[PDB]
Amino acid sequence: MRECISIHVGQAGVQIGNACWELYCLEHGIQPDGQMPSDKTIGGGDDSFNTFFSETGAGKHVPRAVFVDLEPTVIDEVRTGTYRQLFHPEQLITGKEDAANNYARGHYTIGKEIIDLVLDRIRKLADQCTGLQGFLVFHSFGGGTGSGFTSLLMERLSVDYGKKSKLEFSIYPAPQVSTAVVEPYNSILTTHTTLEHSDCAFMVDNEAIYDICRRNLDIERPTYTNLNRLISQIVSSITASLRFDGALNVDLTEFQTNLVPYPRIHFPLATYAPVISAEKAYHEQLSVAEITNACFEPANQMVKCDPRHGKYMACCLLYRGDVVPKDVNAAIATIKTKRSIQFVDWCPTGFKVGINYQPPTVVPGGDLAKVQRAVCMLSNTTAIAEAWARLDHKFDLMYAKRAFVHWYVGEGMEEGEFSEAREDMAALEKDYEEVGVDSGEE
Amino acid sequence: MREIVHIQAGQCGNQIGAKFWEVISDEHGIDPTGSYHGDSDLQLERINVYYNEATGNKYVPRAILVDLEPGTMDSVRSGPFGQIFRPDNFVFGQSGAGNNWAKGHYTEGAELVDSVLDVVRKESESCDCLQGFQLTHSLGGGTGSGMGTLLISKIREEYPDRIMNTFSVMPSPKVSDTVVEPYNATLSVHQLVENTDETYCIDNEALYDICFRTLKLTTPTYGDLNHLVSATMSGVTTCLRFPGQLNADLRKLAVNMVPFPRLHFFMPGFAPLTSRALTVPELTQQMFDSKNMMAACDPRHGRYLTVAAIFRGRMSMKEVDEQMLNVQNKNSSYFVEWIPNNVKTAVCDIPPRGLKMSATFIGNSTAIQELFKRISEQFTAMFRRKAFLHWYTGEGMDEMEFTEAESNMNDLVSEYQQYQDA
Amino acid sequence: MEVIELNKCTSGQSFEVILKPPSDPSLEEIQKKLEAAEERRKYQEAELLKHLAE
Amino acid sequence: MYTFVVRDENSSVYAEVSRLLLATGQWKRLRKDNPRFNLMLGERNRLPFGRLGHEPGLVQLVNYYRGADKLCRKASLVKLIKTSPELSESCTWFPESYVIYPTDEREVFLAAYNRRREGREGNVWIAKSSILISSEASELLDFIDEVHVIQKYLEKPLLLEPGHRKFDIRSWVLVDHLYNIYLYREGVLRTSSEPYNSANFQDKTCHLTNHCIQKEYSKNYGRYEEGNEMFFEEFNQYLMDALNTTLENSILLQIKHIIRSCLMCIEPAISTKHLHYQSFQLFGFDFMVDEELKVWLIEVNGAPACAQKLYAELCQGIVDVAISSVFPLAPTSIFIKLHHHHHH
Ligand SMILES: Nc1nc2c(ncn2[C@@H]2O[C@H](COP(=O)(O)OP(=O)(O)OP(=O)(O)O)[C@@H](O)[C@H]2O)c(=O)[nH]1
Ligand SMILES: Nc1nc2c(ncn2[C@@H]2O[C@H](COP(=O)(O)OP(=O)(O)O)[C@@H](O)[C@H]2O)c(=O)[nH]1
Ligand SMILES: Nc1ncnc2c1ncn2[C@@H]1O[C@H](COP(=O)(O)OP(=O)(O)O)[C@@H](O)[C@H]1O
Ligand SMILES: [Ca+2]
Ligand SMILES: [Ca+2]
Ligand SMILES: [Ca+2]
Numbered sequence A: 001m002r003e004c005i006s007i008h009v010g011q012a013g014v015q016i017g018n019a020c021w022e023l024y025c026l027e028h029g030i031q032p033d034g035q036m037p038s039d040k041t042i043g044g045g046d047d048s049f050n051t052f053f054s055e056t057g058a059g060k061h062v063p064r065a066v067f068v069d070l071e072p073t074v075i076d077e078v079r080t081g082t083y084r085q086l087f088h089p090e091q092l093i094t095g096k097e098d099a100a101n102n103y104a105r106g107h108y109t110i111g112k113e114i115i116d117l118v119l120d121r122i123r124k125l126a127d128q129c130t131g132l133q134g135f136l137v138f139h140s141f142g143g144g145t146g147s148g149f150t151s152l153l154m155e156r157l158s159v160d161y162g163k164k165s166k167l168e169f170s171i172y173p174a175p176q177v178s179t180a181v182v183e184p185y186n187s188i189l190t191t192h193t194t195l196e197h198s199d200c201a202f203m204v205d206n207e208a209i210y211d212i213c214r215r216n217l218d219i220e221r222p223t224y225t226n227l228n229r230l231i232s233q234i235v236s237s238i239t240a241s242l243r244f245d246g247a248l249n250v251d252l253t254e255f256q257t258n259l260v261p262y263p264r265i266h267f268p269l270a271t272y273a274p275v276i277s278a279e280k281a282y283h284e285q286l287s288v289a290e291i292t293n294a295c296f297e298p299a300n301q302m303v304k305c306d307p308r309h310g311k312y313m314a315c316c317l318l319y320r321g322d323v324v325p326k327d328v329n330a331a332i333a334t335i336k337t338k339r340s341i342q343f344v345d346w347c348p349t350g351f352k353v354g355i356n357y358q359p360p361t362v363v364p365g366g367d368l369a370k371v372q373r374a375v376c377m378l379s380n381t382t383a384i385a386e387a388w389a390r391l392d393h394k395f396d397l398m399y400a401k402r403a404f405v406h407w408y409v410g411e412g413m414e415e416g417e418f419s420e421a422r423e424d425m426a427a428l429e430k431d432y433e434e435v436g437v438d439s440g441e442e
Numbered sequence B: 001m002r003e004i005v006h007i008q009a010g011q012c013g014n015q016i017g018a019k020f021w022e023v024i025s026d027e028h029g030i031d032p033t034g035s036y037h038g039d040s041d042l043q044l045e046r047i048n049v050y051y052n053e054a055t056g057n058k059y060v061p062r063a064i065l066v067d068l069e070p071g072t073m074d075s076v077r078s079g080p081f082g083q084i085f086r087p088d089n090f091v092f093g094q095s096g097a098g099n100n101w102a103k104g105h106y107t108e109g110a111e112l113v114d115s116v117l118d119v120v121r122k123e124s125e126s127c128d129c130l131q132g133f134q135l136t137h138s139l140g141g142g143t144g145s146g147m148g149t150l151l152i153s154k155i156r157e158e159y160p161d162r163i164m165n166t167f168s169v170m171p172s173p174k175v176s177d178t179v180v181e182p183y184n185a186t187l188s189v190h191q192l193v194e195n196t197d198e199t200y201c202i203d204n205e206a207l208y209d210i211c212f213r214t215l216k217l218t219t220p221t222y223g224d225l226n227h228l229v230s231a232t233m234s235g236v237t238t239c240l241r242f243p244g245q246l247n248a249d250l251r252k253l254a255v256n257m258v259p260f261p262r263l264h265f266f267m268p269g270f271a272p273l274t275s276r277a278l279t280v281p282e283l284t285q286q287m288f289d290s291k292n293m294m295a296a297c298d299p300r301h302g303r304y305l306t307v308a309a310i311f312r313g314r315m316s317m318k319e320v321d322e323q324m325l326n327v328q329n330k331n332s333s334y335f336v337e338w339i340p341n342n343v344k345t346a347v348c349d350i351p352p353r354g355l356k357m358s359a360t361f362i363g364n365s366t367a368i369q370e371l372f373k374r375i376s377e378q379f380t381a382m383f384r385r386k387a388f389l390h391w392y393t394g395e396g397m398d399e400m401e402f403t404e405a406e407s408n409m410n411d412l413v414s415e416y417q418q419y420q421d422a
Numbered sequence C: 001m002e003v004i005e006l007n008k009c010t011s012g013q014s015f016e017v018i019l020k021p022p023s024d025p026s027l028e029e030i031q032k033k034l035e036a037a038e039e040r041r042k043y044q045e046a047e048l049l050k051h052l053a054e
Numbered sequence D: 001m002y003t004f005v006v007r008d009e010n011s012s013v014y015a016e017v018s019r020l021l022l023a024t025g026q027w028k029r030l031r032k033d034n035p036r037f038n039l040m041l042g043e044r045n046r047l048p049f050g051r052l053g054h055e056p057g058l059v060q061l062v063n064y065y066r067g068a069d070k071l072c073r074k075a076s077l078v079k080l081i082k083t084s085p086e087l088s089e090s091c092t093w094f095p096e097s098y099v100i101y102p103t104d105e106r107e108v109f110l111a112a113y114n115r116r117r118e119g120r121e122g123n124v125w126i127a128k129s130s131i132l133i134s135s136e137a138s139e140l141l142d143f144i145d146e147v148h149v150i151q152k153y154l155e156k157p158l159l160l161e162p163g164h165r166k167f168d169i170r171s172w173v174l175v176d177h178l179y180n181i182y183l184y185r186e187g188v189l190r191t192s193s194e195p196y197n198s199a200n201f202q203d204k205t206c207h208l209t210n211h212c213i214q215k216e217y218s219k220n221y222g223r224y225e226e227g228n229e230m231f232f233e234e235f236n237q238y239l240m241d242a243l244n245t246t247l248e249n250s251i252l253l254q255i256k257h258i259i260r261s262c263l264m265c266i267e268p269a270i271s272t273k274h275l276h277y278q279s280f281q282l283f284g285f286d287f288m289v290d291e292e293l294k295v296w297l298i299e300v301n302g303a304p305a306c307a308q309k310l311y312a313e314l315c316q317g318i319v320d321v322a323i324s325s326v327f328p329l330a331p332t333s334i335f336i337k338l339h340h341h342h343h344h
């Protein structure tokens, strides 16, 4: 067994973290007080769940997690809520004033003042590990802390844990729930500075989640709570292989190996099915063929884009519930004759498949219905670059006028950092285009 | 980012400031003796932004009351909520400022300003993490205008990394005390351009028109004007005062609202306009209506750089989002295209007193140049003949300082015009 | 369509199906970048206080 | 009020559609870079499909299908036909075609060239790109060298009379957001005003029927009809008078078959049915007819013009079926809806 440390940064990172650990506890039968009856080895162990939980002699299972936010109100809620007992005080780190939706303020001004502390608290977690694999980092692109402090943390994490893998779960900005006009600036600044330090990043566009909640959970106006419960299901589907017995994606390194042949092109598209309303009185349960087919619908993706007009480098299918390989292969065969699934020439057209027999767990009283089988597809497709294009365009519109730039320079960031970051994004768009594309009044 | 220190200066500043405290105290369930008697926890969750907690579960406005004569503050102290203010936070002289910016800024005000700063410092000192300051004042008189901007300068020098926010009442011949108001306002605007982060432009012109044209008030009094102002002030501070996601503190508001540092003068609007059932569609239409704007500028004469909209009361958020999108989608030309998604919307469940629901509008529009052009024209009509200048040169000022203030305000105008056309 | 590397356990199974074959900055540097930015905040602030002193 | 942007100023069809949308009084045009539009009349090249369907509160529609270029590019069409089972290398309404780079189908092309050359079979081919007619391969290959397609040249065209002259048929086809396929009832024949001469593929005015070409090199341009355009009523009368048949029977059935076959083949690749934005597109299909009254597809155009006397009607039809279908305003359809569901 090799440990993984989760780090939750800023409001989106912290609140998503809360949702994930709640779900993890339900999945492993760990109670809010941290006790885990089914765990017969009191006070230690090297089971697969121990990758995410440590143990006390009192039999308390403690998330291997650090929460960091530059203001206290969100984390104070972690300290005072259901799972308050789960976490030791030192795991929950707060400042007094936040980054004011300003990457430069989170990264330079306030970051400089809290980074050594955050690192010390992580070091403490690391010293509890006999074989630390590396880090799962949750944050938004749009917030000042989410963007600016994370990039600083990732830089330093590479320095202090040079051999460790780092995975990201990143929230891409969507105006329907966003809180700042400058979020495109922050997204591009943080992506630029973080790119070389992240081995694999799962981007979730709030717009996609928002619309899935509206359309499939019949939620008229989704809240962060609705959104985060759904995100936590997807995150759980993705990390299940680290936390349960199995032979696919069993360590962080395997994520890069299976999903990222090109280091910079490390943003796999997640697609999830089925999402069914718990209030739906009568629901016909979906087959393996039906939920697999649904993996190739844009409406189910964590980022709206069109994989038909792109190319795949890799594809993994992660099932939970009553699923056997025979039906998966039958499903795929059929889907292959209908869908447009084009791989790049230098990769095999194939699927790595993982099946965990335990159906998805849902939070009692949540919005999601219990289902007999679910799947999360992780495909590394060039189509996700549509989302960079969207961001880069918005960035360009404002930057041409230097709108809001004075806020970043005033924190001691140089203007040149804007155009350097943008140039990197341009290079990134070009890379996706080359990988993914071939070459009048009439 | 928690505590705000409130300062109110001079006659206008103190009268509207007092009304602001009356209004929000009611909203937060604080009675005139500082005792809490509300029925909701939403009331107390962020109460510390504006109030200190004293002994006995007493809540005390973090508020400093300044004037160069005692008259208006004697009245404040006699006012309904007058006893809630901290007695040592009343700082006043005896001389008056005679509607003279020079007296407020350079002579009479100079003599008093240090003692104001002693009180501000004592307030800031007990703050767990001061966000910054809000100042209420007029620009047309002497104390609020000349001493108020002196204060802002000294406060910046002592807290240069904190946010400075003002509610600044702009003079109008329609509601005018003296002929020198354009002089005092031009001198003050230059101070504001340099030393505030966010200024709510409250135009006595707009307030009078609304009272006359819309509220059917034949003979509007300063009291009627202040009804609109206190309603607006409550609206624009809702996000600072109650739990919420958007513009929840002064810096995040500035970052969302101010794309270029000098262009930080906001046109506020409010609906419904008051002196029995409004739909989200109606709130939305009325909040964006020129007739509901408190700065007498035609927003169709310019473009919106940024907008914040705040809806209060129990209502459908779905419908709110739909209507806000409808406004932008159907009048998209008036929103600059080079700042994508430049309209932000908050919703707060608690409505203001006497209404089921309400909406407050904060616009950064290039049309605000019309208000400065108007002041600039009035300034020049007099300054070209050096009329009334002796009142200022007698306090040691020279004409060059007038030429400079005028030039900088014309520069401000040219700068709005630049982004109107970009 | 070939199936490979089938692994089974009590908790589930995994396999691969092929449909067709093919056809950093040091700590030092980080600190200097943060101090450069801090110096710049300091310079801008000093400029401000100078202007206010005038 | 619905809103739209115009991003191809050089398009005559959509300039007319724009003219029409305004004239309803319920559509407003925005600056071309304003993002809050219902309808994009897009640019021909590198249309930013990735930026569509991300505007909360706006149902967005665009007048191009992403991916339709597969049908509308010489080299792409050849590949699409050979490699798609529904069409296949054995497809009977598309002339033998090979993609030749200056992968490359050279050795395969020559093989069929030689095969014909040994069987004595007529052996004229035509090379063209996105034009040389010849019976010698060496010439065909050498020209290119100096991506293309070589295509069996239809040595036995149907020739109009009087004139002994060649022609091609343009059909306009509108595919809407539901993937309904609408064939405009009016087509047009682009005629050659010069008699067909099969002992000289050097002079191409009698071999290539493009309007532009007849409008210059042909000294009989306009001689038989205005300008070099015969419309369906007349062509039908001709077929009745001369060959004792109708346009519908001898030709149009094959055309509808071909149009439906092409578009149904690429539907899974380009359909916007479950997509966050929606597409429609107007296509110009070009056909040749041989002396057996057999129809051959020559090419599909992705951004066609219309015959002068047909803009009004077709352009009105576009807003009727493609636009007002999605964005309804406050017959005797000019289109034939191409649908057919044989059971087996
Ligand atoms: N899915 C989801 N998105 C969130 C959540 N909270 C905030 N966001 C998104 O994150 C972005 C804002 O970033 P935050 O995480 O709130 O900001 P922060 O990291 O705390 O940084 P500062 O407040 O500026 O110091 C916006 O795009 C929000 O819509 C959440 O709980 N869930
Ligand atoms: N809205 C409003 N405006 C006022 C009030 N009192 C004065 N004014 C305006 O303020 C200006 C006069 O300045 P004032 O505050 O009385 O002088 P000061 O005491 O020297 O600051 C003029 O433009 C008046 O119209 C008030 O209570 N409400
Ligand atoms: N295989 C062929 N047989 C006979 N004539 C052809 C053939 N291919 C093209 N032509 C002639 O050349 C003209 C132009 O070719 P085409 O590829 O259809 O249009 P364009 O070159 O304008 O894209 C046609 O209208 C037709 O008259
Ligand atoms: Ca154990
Ligand atoms: Ca590394
Ligand atoms: Ca004195």
Ligand SMILES: [Cl-]
Binding pocket: A160, A161, A162, A163, A164
């Ligand atoms: Cl290491």
Ligand SMILES: [Mg+2]
Binding pocket: A010, A011, A069, A071, A098, A099, A143, A145
């Ligand atoms: Mg935050």
Ligand SMILES: [Mg+2]
Binding pocket: B011, B012, B141, B177
């Ligand atoms: Mg007065």
Ligand SMILES: [Mg+2]
Binding pocket: D286, D299
């Ligand atoms: Mg043609």
Ligand SMILES: [Mg+2]
Binding pocket: A442, D299, D301
């Ligand atoms: Mg062509």
